[PDB]
């Protein structure tokens, strides 16, 4: 609960095998529930699609809960309540860093990141900061591309 789903384009087949250790490949767009549907992140826009691995099929991250509900080529929209989006800015800042090669876990990057936030109180992007200081629900459009298995 806190999450309504809408299928915008039906998928090809029966549910994949969202087994622990599954490589799940997908595109996503993130938007405010603006009238404008303001765009925060768009995977395609930066080019490459997103990659994750299922951590534990029995304890799933919020994004895994969405993803695993989908079929290949399904394009589904997830309206997610404010109670789920307080972490999106920090999650987004790490994605953007990955998009620029920088690895948000490597030493120099992670330390530079903490330093920069401790000093200038900012995630490093004006929009993520505005979003952080103003909680709200979000919509995610997810295009499930491919699923591999361990
Ligand atoms: C930073 C560590 C990760 C494992 C990234 C996982 C998070 C995502 C890939 C964001 C996509 C989430 C949506 C709700 C579309």
């Amino acid at each position: 609960e806190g999450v309504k789903k809408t299928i915008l384009h039906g998928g090809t087949g029966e549910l994949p095998n969202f087994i622990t250790g599954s490589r799940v490949i997908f595109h996503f767009r993130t938007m405010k529930c603006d009238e404008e549907r303001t765009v925060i992140d768009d995977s395609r826009q930066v080019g490459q699609p997103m990659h994750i691995i299922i951590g534990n099929m029995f304890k799933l991250e919020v994004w895994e809960i969405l993803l695993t509900s989908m079929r290949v080529h399904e394009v589904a929209e997830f309206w997610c309540d404010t109670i789920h989006t307080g972490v999106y800015p920090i999650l987004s800042r790490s994605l953007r860093q990955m998009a620029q090669g920088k690895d948000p876990t490597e030493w120099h990057v992670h330390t530079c990141g903490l330093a920069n936030m401790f000093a200038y109180h900012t995630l490093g992007y004006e929009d993520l900061d505005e979003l952080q200081k103003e909680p709200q629900p979000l919509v995610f459009v997810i295009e499930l591309l491919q699923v591999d298995a361990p």
Side-chain angles (χ1 to χ4, degrees), residues 1-132 134-150:
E1 275 155 38
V3 172
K4 312 175 163 191
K5 176 184 181 178
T6 298
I7 300 184
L8 307 193
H9 181 70
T12 326
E14 279 294 355
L15 276 296
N17 200 28
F18 294 118
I19 201 163
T20 297
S22 275
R23 197 169 191 120
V24 191
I25 301 181
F26 64 94
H27 274 297
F28 75 101
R29 191 162 128 172
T30 313
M31 301 162 275
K32 313 208 184 134
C33 298
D34 262 349
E35 182 204 43
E36 308 248 302
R37 289 223 136 186
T38 316
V39 172
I40 298 171
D41 293 313
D42 194 310
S43 173
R44 306 192 150 274
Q45 200 272 302
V46 313
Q48 286 296 61
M50 194 73 15
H51 294 42
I52 66 96
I53 316 280
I54 301 270
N56 171 245
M57 56 200 294
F58 315 98
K59 44 172 295 184
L60 296 161
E61 318 290 356
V62 176
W63 60 91
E64 284 168 345
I65 296 307
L66 316 184
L67 283 167
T68 66
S69 94
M70 301 186 72
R71 310 186 172 167
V72 178
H73 304 136
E74 178 176 334
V75 178
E77 141 171 351
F78 302 82
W79 169 93
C80 286
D81 206 20
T82 298
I83 313 308
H84 297 285
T85 69
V87 48
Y88 188 80
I90 287 175
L91 194 74
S92 170
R93 168 198 199 273
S94 292
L95 296 166
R96 310 190 163 174
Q97 275 170 3
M98 292 192 248
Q100 301 151 7
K102 301 170 65 175
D103 174 52
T105 54
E106 186 272 335
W107 188 77
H108 295 61
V109 174
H110 166 73
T111 302
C112 213
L114 282 168
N116 216 251
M117 169 145 70
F118 200 48
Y120 311 117
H121 182 258
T122 184
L123 312 173
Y125 305 95
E126 164 153 61
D127 55 321
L128 300 182
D129 286 333
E130 175 159 40
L131 196 57
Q132 202 54 284
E134 172 75 315
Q136 55 190 278
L138 290 188
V139 194
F140 303 105
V141 176
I142 295 179
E143 169 183 356
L144 174 55
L145 297 187
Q146 198 184 80
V147 174
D148 310 318

